[PDB]
Every structure is written in C-alpha cells, then in structure tokens.
RNA sequence: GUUGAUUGAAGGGAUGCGAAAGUGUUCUGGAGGAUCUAAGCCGUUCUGACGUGCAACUCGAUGGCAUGACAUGUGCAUAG
RNA sequence: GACAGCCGAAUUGGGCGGCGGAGA
RNA sequence: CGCGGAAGUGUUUUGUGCAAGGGCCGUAAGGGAAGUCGGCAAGAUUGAUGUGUAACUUCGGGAGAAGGAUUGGCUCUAGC
RNA sequence: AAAUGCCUCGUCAUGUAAUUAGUGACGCGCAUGAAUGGAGCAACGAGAUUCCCACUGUCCCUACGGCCUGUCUUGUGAACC
RNA sequence: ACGCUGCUUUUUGAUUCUUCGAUGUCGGCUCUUCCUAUCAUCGCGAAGCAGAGAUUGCGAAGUGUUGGAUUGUUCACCCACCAACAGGGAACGUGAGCUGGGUUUAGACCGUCGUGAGACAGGUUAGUUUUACCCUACUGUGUGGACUGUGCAGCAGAUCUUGAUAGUACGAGAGGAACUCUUGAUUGCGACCUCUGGUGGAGCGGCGUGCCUGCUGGCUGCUGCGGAGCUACGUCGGGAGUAUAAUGGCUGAAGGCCUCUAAGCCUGAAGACCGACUGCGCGGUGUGUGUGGCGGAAGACGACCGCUGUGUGUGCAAGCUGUGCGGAUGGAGGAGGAUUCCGACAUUUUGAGGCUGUGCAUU
C-alpha cells in the first residue's frame, strides 16, 4: 500500500510514513522526511539535487 | 500540619519489593477451570520473541451506520514457535494440607536437551512404569504433562539446553485425560492445535533490564527547582519526626527492570509457517513473514509463528509463556486483514520485496 | 443550557493557556488569547490545554472596541502541532486559528477564511457548510 | 608607568545672501575632572564553586574603572 | 362472666428498689 | 586584545573505561514568564558603511535616539 | 495616604479575564512645610520601583549526549567523635 | 425564643513542671501517612415530594478534591474550569532536604518623642544559611541445582460523556425524567519501539582560520543531514466470587388482637473477606550444579543468562550520505604573436565515491 508520492523527490512513500502540510490556500503538500522539509525551507530548487 | 493541595501517590505498592526475577522461565500461577463436557486439549505453550511490524485492517461496519468502513493501522508482535515434545505425566491428589504430587511417569527415551537442563552440561559423567499409571487413574484429582522446547531449530539462540514445564490437561473423565497423553509420549504437538485466530490470550515473561536507576525514573517524582543546592534529581522529604523511622512506602533508588510480569487479553491475529508465503490478504504479492534485511538483532523466521496485537513483555530472543484466558470472553469483532508491511526496519525502508527495489534502479 | 460536544478520537494537543490565536471569521476581532478550556478536570501543576474541535474561553486582545474587555467562547479549527489519524497518517496546518461563538453554539460571523480539518467538520456541521475547503 | 580608536570647543581659510545691520554653507584646527579598548586595577551579581579548603578570605563566570581629587620602589616626619 | 377481639379467668393505674439499652 | 604559530624551556612509557548521585557544558516538537517574593539564571543585540532620527532641554545636549537596509569568491573599469 | 497617614487594602478614575501592586486626582495633614532648607529632573547612576516589545528549558514535563569525579586496582595514609 | 446539660484540643488566654556548659525560631516548594464531625461519587429514608431543580436525615473514609491576578504572608478577596473544587492531626509533620520574601546584630533616610547620648509591636532601603566516611531505619544486592506444593505479607483502577429510550411518563400549560442497550474521553497504574517526534564527540557532505612550499591529501574551527540504541509529544492492557450495613419485606409469639424479631428466614453498598496478580521462608521428589576461558538479551563490584574452538577477517544483502581523483569540452573577461598564457565556477565519464556495530554465507 502506498500513501502517496513525494512532492519534492518524486518517490513513492509507504503507508504510514509521511506528513501532510496544508497551506493557507487549501493546498496540501506531502513530504517524506526532514531531509526534504529543510530543502523547501531554504528555498532550494529540486532540479539542482541529483 | 493538614496539607492543602492533595495529589495521587507516585507509583504502585502492588509490586514492592522490586527485586530481580529468580528465573528466566517463570511458571504460571493458575490454570483455567475444567469443564468436563468437552474433548481433551492443552492450555498453554512456549515460544520466542522475534520483532514487530504493521497491519492495515478494515473495520466492518458496512451497514448504513454513518461510517460504513474505516481503515485502522495496528502494531503487532511476531513470535516463533517450533513444535513441542511430550515426555511425561504427572498427577496430583487432594489432602487436608492441599495438593500432593504422585510419582512421575517418564516415557522411554529422554532427549539430550532435557538432560542438560536437569543435571548440567557435564551430565555424561518396566512394570514399575505400569504400576505408576494405575495411581494417576485411581487417585489424581488433576493431571499435567511435561513438555520441552526444541531450541536447536532456531540457530540464532545458540541454546542446546531446553526449557521444560508442566501444563494442565483440560477435558473430562480423568481416565480419558490419561489415555490421551499415553498415546502422545515422545511425539510432538504444534501450536495450531492449541490456539486459534481471534482469541484472547495471556503472556508471562521477564521485562527488559535497566540496572540501578535514580528515583526520578523508578517512580516518576518531580525535579526540584534550578536554584537548589545538593542536586535536583531526588525526593526532598522522606518523613515526619514521628514515627522516627523511614517507611516502606517512601521512594528510593535501586534496581529497575528484569521483573516478572503477567499481561492479559492479547488478541491473536494470524497463525502460519515461516517457510511459505503469508496470505489471506487482499493484495497479490507473495511476501514471506520477515522484512527486507531481517528482523533487527534477530535472524529470519523459518518455523511456525504466531502474531498477536500490541506490545509484548521482554527482549528479543527471550522465552515467553502463553496461557488461555481465565475470564469470560464475549465474541471478538470480525477480523479482516488486508496488508502486512515488510519494509526494512533498519533505516527508512521504502520497498517491499527486494525484486521491487531491483526494478527501480535498473542497473 | 450546556452545549453538547460529539465524540472525537484522541489527538495531540497544541494550544494552552496564554497562547495567542488568530481570528478566522469577519466578526470584528483580530487576535484572541486563551484563558480556559471546557471539560478540563485537572491535575496538580498541569495547565489546561486544547486540540481542534475543543471549546476555549477567550479574551479579545485586538479588534472592535465593542468586543473588548469581556469573556467570549470560541472553537479551535487549526493548529501547527502534528497529530496522527487512525488510518495511520499524519497532518499539520500552518497557523493557529479559532472562530467566535454564542452561548448556544451559533457562529457570530457569516464567512470563514482558510481550510478546515475533516474531524472538526463532523462535530460541528454548521462550520462545515461555510468552509472553503475540507483538508 | 600609561596601547589603539571615538567625539569635534575657541582660533583661522574659502564661498553664498543682503540697501545696511547682519547672517547661511563648508574646510582647517585639536579643547574637555568628554566615550570605549589594552597593559592592568578593583569587587556588582550568580545569594555559582569551596567550606577537617589550594587558601586563618582562594577559585570561575559576569560586571565596574583605566590622564587621574591616579598607581607604585626608596630617604624623612606623626605613638596609646 | 371482667380485659381482648359468643367466648371462659384473670385485667389494669400510679410509684419505689436492683438490672439492661439510647444520649456517646 | 582575542583566535592560531616559532624561538627558548618543561615532560613520561605495565591502574580502570566508564551504575545512581554530583561539578563544568551541548542540543530540543508545540506553547512563550502560565514559573518565582522578584525574568534569578539563560537566551537575545553586537564590527563596518549608506539611510533615517522624537519628546524634552541649563541651547551645550538628548544621539550610536528609535527604525530600516548592505556585506563572500572571481574577472575587470574609474580617481590620485 | 509621598522612603513622612494611626485609622487603612482611605475615596474616585485608569492599566487586567481577575489589581493589598503602579500611575493620575482629591485633602481638618495621628505626626507635611521653608539653608532643621521648600518647590523643581536638563545631563549623569553595577541606586529603589511598575509596565511594553523582543527573546528564551523559568515553567507545562522532561529527554538524550560530552568531559572530570564517583564505582574497581596499587602506593602513601589522617581527623572529628 | 426565654432557660438548662455536654464533648473536642484546631483559637486565644491562665500557669511555670522539663530544657539557658544551646533541642536551629514564620511561610512556601517537595514527599508520605493517619482522623471523620462526608464536599463529590455508591446504597437508602422524610416532606408544605406532580415532573424538573434543589432542601433535610441515615449506612459509608475505597477513590478524588484543579489552573490563575493582587499580598512575604497564614489569612483574605475576585476570575476561569469542574462530578465536586469538605475540614483537620503527624515537635503549630518536614532548613546536616532546598529557598530566604517576613522576622532579620553591626551602614543609612524620614516622622514623632528627648537638653543630650539615644528611643519607637511606626514606615523605608543594603545586609555569610557550616559538617555524615559511624550506629540504626529504609532501598537494592550477596549468603552454592532442576520441577513444583502451601503458609505468610503486599495489593488498583476511579470518574465523566454521545446517541437511542423520548418531546415519552408527569403536567390546565410552561416545561420535562428513569431502568436497560450504546459512543468516546480525562486521570492513575503496568508494559513496549512497528509508526511519528526529540537526541545522536558514530558516519558522509559544505564553508572557513592557522600550519605542512602550491595543486592533490591531511590536522584544527563553525555548520546541514543523520542510522543503531535510549525515550514521549507516540502505541498497547482490567472479577459478574462469598457473606453483610443502613433501609425495605416473609412467617410469628409475648399480649385470644397487633407487630420485619423475641427462635428462624428473604433481599441488599464505590465498603469487608476471598480470588487473580507480585515478593519471601519452609516442605516434598525415580532429581544436586564446568576449575578456567570467552561472549551477551544481564551487570557499579559480586551475581544472572549461554557455549565449551566456530571466533577474527572478507564477500553479498539491507541502509546513511550525496555525484569522488584525473582527463576531455566550456567560462565574465584580461595579457599579447604562440593561436599561446591566466581564470571563480559549469557539463560529462558517474544514483558516483565513501561509510556501517544489523542479517546471511564462507574461511
């Protein structure tokens, strides 16, 4: 069973392992780990991470 | 004097004194109540703890109650249970001082793992069998058998020295209990012949050890404020002037963990064999019952296993005793399992079935 | 007459006494402060604390001069602390927000800004009908 | 015996306004028991350490003062 | 032919002296 | 000065590996003084260069008021 | 109602959800008051007080980690009572 | 009402029996235990008890009784929540447990009093908190097998709520319940690490200061991610046993009637006892222990759990980091005849290099 796809890295997330974050516009982005939420906070572009 | 602001006391006096256990295989304190209008069966078993995992489950409510079907994710424990061997019979009669044990019947050939437990590792340096069978039939208010485990089938323990116990036999007609166990000496009995799915069970074992611990951890008392001289991890007042002695109900520092505990009402979820594919799930893949990489600090499960809901006392590779319920049980809700997780428990595993990892990278 | 509060599964609590929350309806207020939680029974030294769905007793720190210097009721709708759902997933919002209420349970405003959790929407159906998004 | 900086008084130059009386702007110069920092000197708080001590008054962090109504070696004068 | 509610034999009001029980 | 290096000078070669509790320190979800006699303790601000600076006032001050912005490496241009 | 007011947590206003605190105003002031100096705060203060922003393990409620001690060895080997 | 009789030892007095070759003197914070004259929760009476909401009484001490503003305060007084926010004792419990705000010798200011030195239970500000390594008590630990019996000691869960019952019984109306079933939680207790969060002087990367002549590679400083293990802010888990109290009843005299009582009997509580659960001594039995060494799931040291050569090393699996050196092709521009040199950084070879205490195999 899959929970969803990571919105930063593009990889499948297993059932029970992500955190949904809802924004003020009603948009709920799904991320896998703190390695990924940090790259979003610093405003890095995912295309510069191989 | 009279103390404004009352609060509950910290910890329970049911379990004081808090000493180490004197044994790694505690014996059960009671056995269920015999109903002699049933067939003959056993009331317990011994297994070994392996590790924990997931499961997703469908909460059957599909009537038009406002919530038809929910999903529920539950944690489980796996125990590895090879079959046991019977090698003896025991009877107890009733006297004015209680239960008196009668002489014992041994089978024909006692194994080499039962002789190391009885006489140590250096132990290698008839009609009287028939007369003792008559006593357990005339006398003997209740009957028990002597069973032993086979730890050499799980080569990650390294034992060769078996655990042995006495288990009560339930089912009526004391002469029927005896003849059922005479046709079972020296043979094996498997865990699927004792427990069944969706039943409540008891466990008995020893907890994880922690050594000598301070009083903030052993009992849960408050820390002192930051300005305090002579340390902050402690209790401030240990008594009144009178009585001019310290009481047994005061919190002190000492041994924490490695205690004997009995837990009750654990629900059985699955019963299978490790050397085949787990199924009854609603997904297609094969998936044996063991994660990618293996159970951490444990090998693989290759014999029979049993799966129960929730936490289970003790450490990995330690022996546990399983007992049938002593209470009254109602039904048990209908159980529908549809997924069992088998990712890696080392790190954050994201694949099931290593062939699925192999097809992601290509090469 | 007491307000009935429907059942709700266990959640981690994120709001405590002294937290400043944001007002999410067009009633005139801007900032609220929590001074109490309903249904709190107590424990020595433990502060009363709330999760989304709970009713709080608030004081208006910023807004219309009519509403100030009194005690009000409010429902909590968002929090920034993570909580777990029973299907196994986790979720969080971006701010802490609440909405003002009568002594019988009716909203004071007519509009509500932002999204709302699915838990809050079944306990309080009149809030469901005025929310722009549910999760 | 006393390091490196900060601020910019009087005096002096140039330039603009105005009938006059007068006044704007900006350079130069280097005053004051004027502001920090160093060699160093004290002793605010932690009611910190220590409290048969390293020690019959010390140790750590934090803070105050550092051109003086200063600090310090040595000759002389003042005695119950 | 009482007392009690035709029946057939005892019924009852005040006190005193020991004993026991509430108040505790 | 602090943070690092020379010169000169001083120095040993078969104790253990780390329970509780101490002395001196480091990192913490969500909340943000609800703690306490008392923000005690800790955290926070910090160099330089443009910008922008109020009440009051002994007209000297207040003033570095407050508040906002910029800062690395590389390759060149302009002034004396 | 001041480092000076017994009665006293004086009375009214203002800051708080809630003010024996703070500030403003009132005055028959147990016992204010003029070099016994009175009124008065620009500049200066490791002086005494109350509030605001910022900030945080002060606290809700504690967790995990570092070095030196303690725990264990050999040598030297006291005191209070 | 007017009068009269008691009990307690929580007030403040009255007294001066003990201690002046010294018993640390207020409050708070922390922690344990006891009392009942019961505030709530369980059972049950009365009514000027229709229902709802309260008022008054009896059995009952098992479990609970909170968070803040002002004051050093005890005390007091308000705000918010609550099933409810009862009252007391333990050297006015508790300073080799802390703190030191009150009180608080030696500095100082004000008011009143005194010729003065000085005085004031009048106000204000600044003012050292020493020592256990002894005996006992208490907490663990040790005091030499395996399987069990049975005595003693300890003892745990408590309380609220959603829907239905039902707009029903009751009531002129307005209003407005209960038994039984059912949903979730708060707090206490005992465990556990699959998930999520915290930590992580293990490991990999980035950016610097000094030093090894520069590049490569090192050492030193700051920083991002961060497995295992530990942990909570995360996950799991509760008898329908026996006899009774208050009260209400059955049969029934004394006393031809009456009566729950004098003989007997039925019912009945968050209470009692027992069970289950944890610890210790003593018994029994076809039953008596690996000197040493090495490991761990165990551990301060002793002990406990295992084996009796199956380690170490290496490979694979499963993870963490994030695209290695060298080469080749480029690069804002600058220098100048060679078509040369200087240059941060870019793309490619390359999910690439480095690392691992976990699992499997082999040597």
Swiss-Prot record, chain B:
Sorted UniProt keywords: Cytoplasm, Ribonucleoprotein, Ribosomal protein
Transmembrane regions: none
What's in the GO CC field? cytosolic large ribosomal subunit
Query: One Pfam family this chain carries?
Result: Ribosomal_L3
- List locations, semicolon-separated: Cytoplasm
Q: Which InterPro entries does the UniProt entry name for this protein?
A: L3_arc_euk (IPR045077), Ribosomal_L3_dom_3_arc_sf (IPR044892), Ribosomal_uL3 (IPR000597), Ribosomal_uL3_CS (IPR019926), Transl_B-barrel_sf (IPR009000)
Q: Please give the family membership noted in the entry.
A: Belongs to the universal ribosomal protein uL3 family.
The name this protein goes by in its record: Large ribosomal subunit protein uL3
Curated annotation (Swiss-Prot), chain C:
Q: Which domain of life is it from?
A: Eukaryota
Q: What does the entry give for GO biological process?
A: translation
> What's an example GO cellular component term for this entry?
cytosolic large ribosomal subunit
Q: Which PROSITE patterns match?
A: RIBOSOMAL_L14
Disulfide bridge partners, by residue number: none
Instruction: Enumerate the GO terms in the molecular function aspect.
Output: large ribosomal subunit rRNA binding; structural constituent of ribosome
Pfam short name (any one):
Ribosomal_L14
Keyword set, alphabetical order: Ribonucleoprotein, Ribosomal protein
Keyword Isomerase (UniProt): no
Q: CDD domains in the record, alphabetically?
A: Ribosomal_uL14
- SMART domains in alphabetical order: Ribosomal_L14
> Which HAMAP family does its entry note?
Ribosomal_uL14
Similarity remark:
Belongs to the universal ribosomal protein uL14 family.
* The protein's name: Large ribosomal subunit protein uL14
Q: What species is this protein from?
A: Encephalitozoon cuniculi (strain GB-M1)
């Amino acid at each position: 069973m899959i929970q969803g796809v990571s919105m930063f890295s593009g990889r499948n997330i297993p059932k029970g392992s992500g955190i949904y974050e809802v924004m003020s516009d009603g948009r709920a982005v799904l991320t896998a780990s703190n390695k990924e939420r940090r790259l979003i906070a610093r405003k890095i572009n995912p295309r510069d991470i191989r | 004097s009279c103390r404004k602001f009352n609060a509950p006391r910290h910890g329970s006096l049911q379990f004081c004194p808090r000493k180490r256990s004197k044994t790694i295989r505690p014996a059960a304190g009671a056995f269920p109540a015999d109903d002699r209008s049933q067939p003959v069966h056993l009331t317990g078993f011994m297994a070994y703890k392996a590790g924990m995992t997931h499961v997703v489950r469908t909460k059957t409510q599909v009537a038009k109650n406002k919530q038809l079907s929910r999903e529920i994710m539950d944690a489980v424990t796996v125990l590895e249970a090879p079959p046991m061997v019977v090698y003896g019979i025991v009877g107890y009669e009733k006297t004015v001082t209680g239960l008196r044990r009668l002489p014992i019947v041994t089978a024909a050939y006692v194994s080499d793992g039962v002789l190391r437990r009885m006489f140590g590792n250096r132990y290698a340096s008839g009609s009287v069998c028939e007369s003792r069978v008559e006593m357990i039939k005339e006398r003997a208010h209740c009957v028990r058998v002597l069973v032993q485990t086979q730890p050499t089938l799980i080569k990650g323990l390294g034992l060769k020295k078996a655990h042995i116990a006495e288990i009560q036999v339930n089912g009526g007609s004391i002469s029927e209990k005896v003849e059922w166990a005479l046709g079972r000496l020296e043979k094996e009995i498997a865990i699927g012949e004792v427990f069944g799915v969706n039943e409540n069970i008891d466990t008995i074992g020893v907890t994880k050890g922690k050594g000598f611990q301070g009083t903030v951890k052993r009992f849960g008392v408050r820390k002192q404020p930051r300005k305090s001289r002579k340390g902050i991890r402690k209790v401030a007042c240990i008594g009144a002037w009178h009585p001019s002695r310290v009481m047994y109900s005061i919190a002190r520092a000492g041994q924490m963990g490695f205690h004997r505990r009995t837990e009750k009402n654990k629900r059985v979820y699955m019963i299978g064999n490790g050397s085949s594919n787990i199924k009854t799930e609603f997904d297609l893949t094969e998936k044996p019952i063991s994660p990618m990489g293996g159970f951490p600090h444990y090998g693989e499960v290759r014999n029979d296993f049993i799966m129960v809901k929730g936490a289970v006392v003790g450490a990995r590779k330690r022996v546990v005793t399983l007992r049938k319920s002593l209470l009254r049980q109602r039904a048990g809700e209908e159980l529908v399992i549809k997924f069992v997780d088998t990712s890696s428990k080392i790190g954050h595993g994201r694949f099931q079935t290593s062939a699925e990892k192999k097809a992601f990278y290509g090469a | 007459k007491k307000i009935s509060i429907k059942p709700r599964y266990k959640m981690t609590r994120g709001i405590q006494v002294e937290t400043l929350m944001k007002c999410a309806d067009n009633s005139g207020a801007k900032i609220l402060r929590c001074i109490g939680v309903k249904r709190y029974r107590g424990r020595l030294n433990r502060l009363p604390a709330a999760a989304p769905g709970d009713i709080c007793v608030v004081s208006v720190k910023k807004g219309k001069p009519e509403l100030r210097k009194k005690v009000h009721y409010a429902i909590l709708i968002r929090q920034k602390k993570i909580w777990r759902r029973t299907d196994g997933s986790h979720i969080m919002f971006e701010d802490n927000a609440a909405v003002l209420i009568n002594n019988k349970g009716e909203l004071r405003g007519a509009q509500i800004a932002g999204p709302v959790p699915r838990e809050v929407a079944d306990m309080w159906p009149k809030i469901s009908s005025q929310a722009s998004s549910i999760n």
